[PDB]
Structure 1
Amino acid sequence: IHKIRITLTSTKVKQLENVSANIIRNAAQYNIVKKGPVRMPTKVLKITTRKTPNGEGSKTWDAYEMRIHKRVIDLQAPASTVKRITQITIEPGVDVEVTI
């Protein structure tokens, strides 16, 4: 047995929720007790620049955004089982870190 934490971060929620559900799915048919996923409060990375490359015109501003969504999943399983779950649910957008 091993208390293992899996942290999921990505910018887009569709691939994030697929990986999140897929990990939960593999922790269900395998009789592994789980806690999660925990939807962490999303982070809005905001950058407000001036539209004008020069300094002439009405003072108009862009407001760019970069939402970061974070999910943490707690697993009680041996380390070999949890790591192979990660390769099952590998997605280009979502990065995975595994901590005991």
Structure 2
Amino acid sequence: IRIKLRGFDHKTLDASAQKIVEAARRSGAQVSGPIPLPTRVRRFTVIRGPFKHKDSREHFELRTHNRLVDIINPNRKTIEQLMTLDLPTGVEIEIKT
């Protein structure tokens, strides 16, 4: 019964984990509240200028955040409105059982 929330934007991660954990807590019944998983970090460190100048860099990062919510007592009055819930663009969702 697992919903898994992953994105590049942490404000939209808590968005979806609000509006998801709110859905099942209404139409039945047990939600295992939004868990913040550790973030996977991809750094990009690069010479600033186009030519030589090795000692000056600019640091870039890529935060792929992680969230997980569990629907414990399923109660399929939810499993329908979940086939229809409003996803912000910047997030992928994972459900398996």
Q: TM-score, normalised by structure 1?
A: 0.81
Deviations 1:12-49 (A, max 9, x none): 12221111000111111122212121100122211111
The percent of aligned pairs where both chains have the same amino acid is: 25
Residues 1:70 and 2:66 aligned together = yes
The structure that is helix-richer by fraction is 1
2:37 counterpart residue number? 40
Unaligned runs of 5+ in 1: none
TM-score scaled by structure 2? 0.83
Letter in 1 for 2:7: S
1:16 equivalent in structure 2: 13
Divergent runs of 4+, >6 A: none
Secondary structure class of the residue paired with 1:41: strand
SS in 1 for 2:84: helix
Q: 1:27 to 1:49 in 2, by over 3 A?
A: same
